[PDB]
């Protein structure tokens, strides 16, 4: 907690004690590797919940899927060793990172036909049964999220390993909606206030009044941001945060911006986003009262790839709010084409 920090912007050296908030969201986010707690507890948690009537699992975070994508070989071994008529198949997932209606639970009485290590070898392929258990994926038709579990895991208190390629995880003892507080941070030092986790880099700055400045997402989760890590979280209206509360937006006054309301219908369906306040290339925004009312966000390029030049806003504030994704440059709700339909 004590060390020396060099700052390029201030051209000075900071030496002392305190807390350093690592970025861990740009430049090859490393590592948050994957291994859960003892396998028998997790293995016993599937068929016990399957007896209740569960059908699938959703991942609250993008990386939680990569837990399953490399562990599914292991559970298939133990359930077959326990002659369980079930199968586990994981797949790809895309925003919005959907959430189920229920969750797993102990039953801490685990299976009595399992080993202890988590790195066993000599994998043997198993068969497929008529009873199939799904994982998060494009399966929104056969089984809805009502019969799907979500937010059933939690980061172990001793599960923090940054150099050791592993992070211990345990299942929660109760149902919850908030995100994992164990790997979570927020800070502010006299010019900037940053809320951060493995996926979010919500950053706010002060020019004349405290306001949001930029944000970066590698995932769009659905767990509510806990108030234990929220700066200036009093008297905040739910209709004014730039990032919606449903998408893990921090309930705070630093999530504010004059002239803009909540972006409940932004292009969040893209997996990655970059929120800032500038102009999309080749576009101009002019303040006028006769521009159309706010609606769904519009991509700056049409279906033919042609660019839309002129735009209008009713009561926005320059520079306009725009998004950087894999699709181009999306404007906010309060920005509409000046003459294009």
């Amino acid at each position, epitope marked *: 907690d004590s060390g020396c920090v060099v700052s390029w912007k201030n051209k000075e050296l900071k030496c002392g004690s305190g807390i350093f908030i690592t970025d861990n969201v740009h430049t090859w986010t490393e590592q948050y590797k994957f291994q859960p707690e003892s396998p028998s507890k997790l293995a016993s948690a599937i068929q016990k919940a399957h007896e209740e009537g569960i059908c699938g699992i959703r991942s609250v975070t993008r990386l939680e899927n990569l837990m399953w994508k490399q562990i599914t070989p292991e559970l298939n071994h133990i359930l077959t060793e326990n002659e369980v008529k079930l199968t586990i198949m994981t797949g790809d997932i895309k925003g919005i990172m959907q959430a189920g209606k229920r969750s797993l639970r102990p039953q801490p009485t685990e299976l009595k036909y399992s080993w202890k290590a988590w790195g066993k070898a000599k994998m043997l392929s198993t068969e497929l049964h008529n009873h199939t258990f799904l994982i998060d994926g*494009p399966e929104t038709a056969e089984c809805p999220n009502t019969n799907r579990a979500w937010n059933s895991l939690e980061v172990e208190d001793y599960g923090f390993g940054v150099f050791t390629t592993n992070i211990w995880l345990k299942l929660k003892e109760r149902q919850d909606v908030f995100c994992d507080s164990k790997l979570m941070s927020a800070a502010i030092k006299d010019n900037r206030a940053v809320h951060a986790d493995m996926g979010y880099w919500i950053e706010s700055a002060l020019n004349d009044t405290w306001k949001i400045e930029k944000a970066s997402f590698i995932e769009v989760k659905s767990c509510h941001w806990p108030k234990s890590h929220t700066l200036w979280s009093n008297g905040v209206l739910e209709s004014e945060m730039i990032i919606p509360k449903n998408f893990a937006g921090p309930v705070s006054q630093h999530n504010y911006r004059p002239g803009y309301h909540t972006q409940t219908a932004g292009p969040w369906h*893209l997996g990655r986003l970059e929120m800032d306040f500038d102009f999309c*290339e080749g576009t101009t925004v002019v303040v006028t009262e006769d521009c159309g009312n706010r609606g769904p966000s519009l991509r700056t*390029t*049409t*279906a*033919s*790839g042609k*660019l839309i030049t002129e735009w209008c806003c009713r009561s926005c504030t320059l520079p306009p709010l725009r998004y950087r994704g894999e*699709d181009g440059c999306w404007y906010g709700m309060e920005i509409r084409p000046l003459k294009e339909k």
Partner: antibody
Amino acid sequence: QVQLVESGGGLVKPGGSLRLSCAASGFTFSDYYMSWIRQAPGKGLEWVSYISTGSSHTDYADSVKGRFTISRDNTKNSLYLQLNSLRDEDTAVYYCASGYRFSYVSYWGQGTLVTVSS
Amino acid sequence: EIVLTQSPGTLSLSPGERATLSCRASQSVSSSYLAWYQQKPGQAPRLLIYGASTRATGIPDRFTGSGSGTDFTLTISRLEPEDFAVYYCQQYGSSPAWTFGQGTKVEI
């Protein structure tokens, strides 16, 4: 009429380099997305790369990351692609097409052919 | 990935008939964003549907695009000897693959 003219294709040694240019006319070049599409002999069409209007997106295909470079010049309505570190499977007919991976393609013109062998 | 599938790989018919195509989709295309391209061997590809339902400019009426959801059919009402070519289907958003369709051969 939208005319797309390209030049630069030819036989080159593996590990060499090449430059492909696209000549646009008959439409607002500085208003549409630009992209390059290749087609292996007797195989299906595959995306290569595309560039934005202000040249700020510049996304590249997975197998050519760091080996290809794409650029445009809106003043003279010219689109450029740079070939570097060419390998054996790069032999394909490269089409200069007015499009974008997240959009349909409106204009195609006489894509050139490049061969990478001895 | 919503990589598409084209069936059948090739089609055999005669002039005067009425042909149909099929571009299977992985799941749930968005806003019916599908297109059809004609590859007359050997020339540059053309554009038929934007659009999945709307004929492109300069295209004869016989080319009809239809289908919705996860199944799409490109149907030519009237056969014609020059129409024998290779047709490709492409989904644009979101998020499209890095390659086009496999194509269907139309043979006499």
